[PDB]
Design a protein around this nucleic acid. Sequence first.
DNA 1: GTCTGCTCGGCTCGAGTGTTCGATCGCGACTGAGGACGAACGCGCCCCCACCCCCTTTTATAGGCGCCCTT
Length: 44
Amino acid sequence: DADLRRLSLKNAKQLLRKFGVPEEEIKKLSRWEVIDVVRTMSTE
DNA sequence: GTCTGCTCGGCTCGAGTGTTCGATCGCGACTGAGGACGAACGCGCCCCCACCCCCTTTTATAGGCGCCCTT
């Protein structure tokens, strides 16, 4: 979660693209929501 | 005198209320990351400070050069 917050939005966007997260969540690009979704996907 | 019925008391069970504990949510604080501003360093441009050429005078010396106009 510390390194996930240290992802600095842009690389988290590329990671969400890599996992196969749908483009709506990538599109809103809220940082906190993005990092919560990528933490959830790394839990999944 | 005996038997039977009725009433009262005691015990047990069930329900309700209260208290305690656990879980979830919200708020606050701390840490990390990003952005902006300031300072320092480097590079480029401009201004200055560089130059050895010119210089008028003197003197000795002398060939090439004029010119000098009178016969």
